[PDB]
Amino acid sequence: IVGGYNCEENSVPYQVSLNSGYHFCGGSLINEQWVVSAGHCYKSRIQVRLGEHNIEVLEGNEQFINAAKIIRHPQYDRKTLNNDIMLIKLSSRAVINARVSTISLPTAPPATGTKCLISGWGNTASSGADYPDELQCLDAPVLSQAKCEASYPGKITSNMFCVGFLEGGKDSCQGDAGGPVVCNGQLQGVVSWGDGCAQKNKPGVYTKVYNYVKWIKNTIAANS
Amino acid sequence: DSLGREAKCYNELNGCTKIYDPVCGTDGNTYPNECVLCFENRKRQTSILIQKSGPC
């Protein structure tokens, strides 16, 4: 996250990380046993970590839970990133407390201008490599679809939107994919891609969770 | 010899996935994923190769 801040305590209890011997993506706890992330985060083995803030120094409330089932969206497109969404079934159920809890799915598609909180342990530098210990947070509003599609001509499908600032300087970055875009208590977006990070006229593009609400419950139900 | 693989891109678009899946350049620099590396080779007109997967 570029241009963000240290998340206050227990400010994002739904945040999780996906791990393959290093921290490589974020995700969101949406059910006692399920995390949602991006399709490009797929790996054949994944360990989920919940309740972190400092990713290098244990604070004591961390839970380490390997993925039992890992389900990339069946129409995931590696070349265009359309349907860049993924479900993960935890092999045991998370213990719910003040630092680990679920977040609701959205009851309506993103609304232009709503303020959202985006979070993750991705890059904090727009040039180079500066990856933080402390979990990062960014308030940034949803941008209009006029603005979004002008920013990425021909490449924004109906399963995508833009969050941030056209003037640049504040964005999600590498290592943040899969992480949450939460607006008024609903998971509206998943960190997916962009042209670099925090550049002029290149805001982050995020998967619109509302379009998969039905698939998520159905796919979860079949594997419960 | 013992050379490096040319980096390549799949995203026929204007941007890159935001995974962290670093790769080690022949310049000694770790790039967070292969896509970001091909963009730098386009942008700065360079030709860094992939020495090996993972960080440098």
Residue numbers in the entry:
A (entry chain A): 24 to 247
B (entry chain D): 24 to 79
From the primary publication:
(1) The serine protease inhibitor Kazal type 1 (SPINK1) inhibits trypsin activity in zymogen granules of pancreatic acinar cells. TRY1 adopts the typical serine protease fold containing two β-barrels sandwiching the active site cleft of the protease. The inhibitor assumes a typical Kazal domain structure with a reactive loop surrounding a central α-helix. SPINK1 binds on top of the TRY1 p.S200A active site in a substrate-like manner, creating an interface of almost 1000 Å2.
We solved the crystal structures of TRY1 p.S200A bound to SPINK1 WT and p.N34S at 2.9 and 2.1 Å resolution, respectively. The specificity determining P1 residue Lys41 is oriented in a way that interacts with Asp194 in TRY1. The oxygen of the carbonyl carbon is stabilized by the oxyanion hole formed by the backbone nitrogen atoms of Ala200 and Gly198. In the present structure, Ser200 is replaced by an alanine to avoid proteolytic cleavage of the inhibitor or the protease due to residual protease activity observed even in the inhibitor bound complex. Unexpectedly, His63 exhibits an uncommon rotamer conformation, pointing outward and away from the catalytic triad. Instead, it points toward the sulfate ion bound within the SPINK1 loop. With this uncommon histidine conformation, TRY1 would not be able to catalyze the cleavage of the P1-P1′ scissile bond, as His63 could not function as a proton acceptor for Ser200, thereby not creating the strongly nucleophilic alkoxide ion. To analyze the impact of SPINK1 binding on the catalytic triad, we employed molecular dynamics simulations by using TRY1 WT and SPINK1 WT complexes, with His63 starting in either gauche+ or trans (Chi1 = 60° or 180°) conformation. SPINK1 binding sterically blocks the His63 rotamer conformation to flip from one state to the other most of the time.
